[PDB]
Amino acid sequence: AITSVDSYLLSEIKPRLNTVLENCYIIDEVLKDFDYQTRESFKEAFCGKNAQHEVTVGFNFPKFKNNYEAHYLIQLGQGQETKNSLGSIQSSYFEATGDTLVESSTAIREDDKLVFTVSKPIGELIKVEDIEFAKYDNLQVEGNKVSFKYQTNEDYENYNANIIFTEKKNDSKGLVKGFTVEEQVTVVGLSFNVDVARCLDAVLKMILISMRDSIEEQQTFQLQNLSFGDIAPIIEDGDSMIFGRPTIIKYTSSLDLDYTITQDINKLTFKERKD
Amino acid sequence: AITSVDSYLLSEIKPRLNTVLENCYIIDEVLKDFDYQTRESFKEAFCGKNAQHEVTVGFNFPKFKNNYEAHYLIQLGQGQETKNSLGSIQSSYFEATGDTLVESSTAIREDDKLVFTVSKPIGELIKVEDIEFAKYDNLQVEGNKVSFKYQTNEDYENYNANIIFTEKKNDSKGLVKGFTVEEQVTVVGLSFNVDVARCLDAVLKMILISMRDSIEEQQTFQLQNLSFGDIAPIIEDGDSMIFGRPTIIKYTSSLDLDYTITQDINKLTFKERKD
Amino acid sequence: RKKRDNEIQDFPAEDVQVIVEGNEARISMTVYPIRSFKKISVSLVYKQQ
Amino acid sequence: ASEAKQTVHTGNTVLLMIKGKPVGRAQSASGQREYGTTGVYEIGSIMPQEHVYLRYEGTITVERLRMKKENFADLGYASLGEEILKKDIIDILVVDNLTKQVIISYHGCSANNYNETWQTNEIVTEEIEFSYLTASDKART
Amino acid sequence: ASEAKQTVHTGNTVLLMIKGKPVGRAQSASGQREYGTTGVYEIGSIMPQEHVYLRYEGTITVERLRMKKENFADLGYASLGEEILKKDIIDILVVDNLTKQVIISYHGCSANNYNETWQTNEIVTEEIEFSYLTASDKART
Amino acid sequence: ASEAKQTVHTGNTVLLMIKGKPVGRAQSASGQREYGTTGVYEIGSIMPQEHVYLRYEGTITVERLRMKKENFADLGYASLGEEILKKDIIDILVVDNLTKQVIISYHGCSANNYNETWQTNEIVTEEIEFSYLTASDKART
Amino acid sequence: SIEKKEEVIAHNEVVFRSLTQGLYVKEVDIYSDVVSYTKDVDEALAMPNTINFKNSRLIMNLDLEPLNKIQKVIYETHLEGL
Structure with missing residues (x-):
């Protein structure tokens, strides 16, 4: 089962982010430590069912213009192989x-x-x-x-x-051949207002925390690690700077393939010999 | 409880810095090792209730002009995840x-x-x-x-x-899910006069020492470490250079979220079986 | 623990059932009662030598 | 996608529970069991004719970061003196985060030694080693 | 090109099999054998006149990552209490991935000790050490 | 923000105090306790029927940087010869920096061994190991 | 037309509703007396619809209009010709 971490991240983020931004109580819980001004401004702008402004998420290098008021930007990053089993064997299954x-x-x-x-x-x-x-x-x-x-x-x-x-899926049986891969994926929030970027990063951290109870990454993407970069001006050539704080997410997953077996024994031929 | 280290730093620094600069005795205690000239000049400029000149503190990339006679500049810096618990469990609470x-x-x-x-x-x-x-x-x-x-x-x-x-807050009960984060935050003093920068750095060090008795960082931001950079010209393109000595502050905090539980047992159904 | 204290002689480990429903739980299990010694029948045969 | 046929346990899919209470900020735990197997050697053979089980010894260790509240001493699970004599046995359960099903449970756990380290540059840690009567992996699906 | 005259075994050309079932996510295994050689020293010689075999002791260890299913406890190969007494012997086979020919087989394996480690930052691992009666390298070409 | 429900102890929230005097430039301390648990094995069981406490042994170590004044020798707490025989017991307290409440106290501490290291490239350090009668965690809230 | 069909009942619950205002219950107090109301039909407070629960505790207020809520989710396929 080949793993596409980026698509899983997008699918987990979009509905969960929408639900979190839906209500004010959760946002107030999240932004407890922040000051009154930035907290209330972010709540006015983005929070609530009837919010006029809205955040977005997408992959990098989009040919179209992308909204820079508040956006989550994803890029794939590096990967490495960390552990292996004998014969690359991960598991054995009787039924697909x-x-x-x-x-x-x-x-x-x-x-x-x-x-x-x-x-x-x-x-x-x-x-x-x-x-x-x-x-x-x-x-x-x-x-x-x-x-x-x-x-x-x-x-x-x-x-x-x-x-x-x-x-x-099927009644056939086979072997699971594969290894473990240690992958890094980068996520960064973009905003021309730095305070919005800070609040966006906090929300991102909270949803990453919440994701750990998800079935899929409980079964597939264990050992989540996080790392945060410095607030930097992403772009200076515009009329106003873009500010964003990249975050690096790590995961461990098992790339594997099912190798079917056609050998099935159903009879025995125990016979002696003579000389 | 998501942690905003920058806001906490600002809130701790502003009243404490004002109080320290209010009186001369504390400043004289701080600047014991410095020479007479710089000590007395800084005391004349900034120290005392009736001081005409005043220091300021704020975050980086302000769209407005910022006073460069004496200012404390903060920027967020990097962060890293260092330790985890089983199931990301930090603590259990019966009452919010x-x-x-x-x-x-x-x-x-x-x-x-x-x-x-x-x-x-x-x-x-x-x-x-x-x-x-x-x-x-x-x-x-x-x-x-x-x-x-x-x-x-x-x-x-x-x-x-x-x-x-x-x-x-509430009578509900839940679980605390989260991890520990090792964060670095950079603080630098700015002044076109190098001696003022040196004295400002010393004052910064003293207030960092004093902060260790604070409740919040005793409970939230343990394991404070410090690191100082070299005195460097921040800017050369002006009529006169800006001189500042960046300092890096490290902290350890527990990013966590409260997961509520609705399951409450109040009755028991102990019955036997027959065959 | 009871078996280790000899309070019960034997029991089925797999027979237990547990069901939870909101604020209530149902528990069902079986244990074999102890059996005491009741009857003895004896016969004698006399023989020479 | 998530094929359960290859999944493994990790620190994020496990909970350590005592008396229903999940112990907080627990770091690691190790379990040991010794059946004391010994061979039987006849006169007319260097090879061991057979092996036999003789003695069951088992210990479990737990590493934790001392929370300001609900530490092992405050919880009453551990002891610091003659109070130990009034402490009854306990059962330590390792339960799945996902399903809340049990993975392995230790019955009749008893404390063996207690270690705590106070250090300047690092968070406080404490370690406990228990000796248990029996282990069990029942109550599965 | 592939000249077989110089090939060697590696982790990608070996399978660990029990009762026909390939154990999954197995990491390492080590085998030990002791013939207990001892010398014979006469009075008129410091040198050992000859060596003699006296005692055959052998153990094999296996390291594994605890899968959520088919762990050594669930498979019934290991044991956690008095259930061990009803566990019969087993044979552990190391078989070639390429040809499915046997490389070495251990007969009459019996369990010695059981170790499992629960850790926060790493995948769960378990280790088993067996004691076997005899080893064999038969059934070759 | 500061939620006390998850706080832990560290080097910046602890004080080491003797006779009310806070010992200065203290680096680390470790505490050990051994209950000497032993099992009881019947003839008709490999399993231990029960465990019992037998013997209480406990030691505490302290690492310090030798200040020019108020070192353990100058304070009279330690000893360097027959002066030890006239040294009475002491109580070593670990107290919270925030509240000044007690976290754990050792009663009837007695000195076991004394170590000091003179080195060229590093600050002087000394280590002491004590043996205590009983530990206590009383006087809490 | 239909080639294959199956019906399952995802949930079966009892919803509480006010008789005067007409709004359903959203949040409640310690004794489960009402403190909040909502116009939503799904978000409303609800409990499992089985006799055991009913015998295990209507009990909160005299606004005695509970509503048995049953959710039907159906899977089906079609083969529509040209």
Whole structure:
């Protein structure tokens, strides 16, 4: 599973940043240490549902003009290989598996079992929220749905559960070959007003903190490290300077490829010899 | 609690610098090692309540002209992440808490208890000056005020105490997620007279020494380190050069965010099974 | 711990069930009761030599 | 994308919990187990005919930064004198940050030695080493 | 070009296999053997007249990164308590990535000690040390 | 801003005090405690049925830069010969710089060994190791 | 037309609503008495819709108009011809 850190960063940042800027309480919590003036100015400009001004995020070298009132700029940076396993072997799988999904699913009644439906089939069930099925419940997964004994659990006929599971792709089996890569990605906020840049950097730090609970980087992009540069004038040739403070984010991910195996043994030929 | 080191530096420097320059005794103590000439010239120019000349402090890249007779210039500098905890967990709290406050409060008489009033409610009481309440005194905090038994302490009805306490924000509980950051901030004094710059640097060093007793950096910005650059001509294109000696200040702070928890257990369902 | 103190002789480890629902939790488990010694039947055979 | 078939544990996906309380600013922990395997040597063989288990010894260490509150001494988990004799056993749990499922739990933990370092240029640290009766990896999926 | 007359083994040409299952994210392994050679000294000689083999001791260590699944505890190969007594012997095979031929196999492996490290800034690692009855390099070409 | 819920101790928030006198230019200090836990092994079990406390041993070390005045020898706290026999016990206190509250105190401290280093390129340092009867963390809030 | 279809119930909850103002509850106090109201239908305070919870605590105020809220999310595909 080749990793595109930049796209993941963008997808995590955009909705999360919009949600954070949606409400004032979270912003006030974030900007507790800042002075009244800059805090209130940033809140007036960008914060709130009905904010007239808006921030943006995008990759570097855009052929079009880019808004320099407040923008998050991303560039890919360097990368390095840090650790390897014997034969480049990372893991072995019997059934092809895709991404790990989290889905909410209300309990349902079936003639012998309570069940939960899901969007897609199941390759493996990791966890059901606040449940530890015993032998009596006889937890079974049958494609799309997971099921447990009806009678002794009948109080929970409409349990508002949620599920963490894994997609199923194929029944084939193979080996995972790959290594670990230690990658650096640079993120910088741009603004002709330095105070806006400072507040933007603080918001960036908070959303990076919040991201650590995300499933994907919990499973794929562990060992997050941060590093901040100095406030510098990005450009001097305009009528007014652009000010930005670059930040460097580090991640560790496992670049890997699935090598299928067609060998399947189903018969044995134990015979003696004579001389 | 996101940390803005620059604003804290400014807020600590301005009143403290004004107070230090207010009186001559402290300045004479500071400038003991310097020669008579420069010491007395600086005292004549800047020291004293009725000083005609005055120093200033502000951030870098101001669009307006800035006074270059004597000024403290700040710029943010670099930063780095140095240490982490398991799961990025820093601390656990049952009640939301804000800043740590110190308030003076004269004792008061209540029909059963001596009490101290405070400006704001109490989340936690750290210390009461020169007091170690015993069981007999039965120390209790009830929102705004703290109280102890009247009878055996009646000699102290007007005790001129002071209190170190913590604000109360909410009754909710959550987890503190974050890490430690090792940050560098640059401070430089500017003056077209080199001797004034030297004296200004000495004053800066003294106020940095004095700051170490401050509550906030005792609680937030531990491990202060200093580094001084060489006296250099900041600018040569004017009629006369600007001379300044940059200084680098290091700090360690814990960037963190409070993650609330809505799960509260209040009932138990211990039941057996049959087969 | 109880087994280490001989208070219980045996039990199934995997039989436990736990369910949480808002502010409530359900716990279900099984333990085998101890069995005491009740009956003995004896027969004798007399023989020569 | 996130294929769970290759994921590994790290410091950001683990929690150290005691009595439900997550210990704060915990840095590292190590676990050791010794089965005391020994071989059996006959007269007519240099090779060991078989190995046998004899003795189970296990210790776990924890490194922490001394918070001003809820340190191991204040929590009552550790001890500094005869107060130790009244301290009962504890269970130390390593639980997954993502699912809150258990990864490994130590039962009947008891304290062995206590170390604290006061230093000028670095944050205060303390180390504790426990001896436990048994380990368990139950309560899985 | 590739002249096989000078090739050597490396981490990319080796697989570590147990019960047919390739253990994943395995990092290193070391093998030790001691024949316990001792000399015989006569009265009329400082020199050792001859050496003799007396005792065969051998251990193998394995270092691994704890995957969230199929860790040594979950696989049942290791143990954490009295469950060990019901664990039978195993054979650990080092097999060539290219040909799938065997390079060296350890027979009758038994576990000696178990180590796991939880750390904040690094991936979790675990180490196991086994004691084996005999080694073999058979099944070659 | 300063949220006390996450604060930790460092070299700038601690004082080392003896007899009320703050010792000057003190660099580091380490504290050790050993409860001497031992297990109990029955015949019918490899596992330790229980652990028991047996023996309390504790030492504290202090590193200092030898000031020209008020060194440990001049203060009378240390000793250099038979003068030691007339030296009574002392209590070494670690007290908070902010509040002047106590963090940990060692009672009945007695000196174990004394080390001093004279070097050409570095400031003079001396080290003392004490053995104490009991430790205490009382007098808190 | 439809080639394949499946329906699942993502959530099933009980929403509380005022009888006079018509606004739903947003935030509450320690006893869970109302302190804030909202016009949104989804953001409103809600609890799981199962009998066990109902027996485990209507209880806060006499404005006795709860609302059983059920969310249906449907996956489907079409093969529309030319």
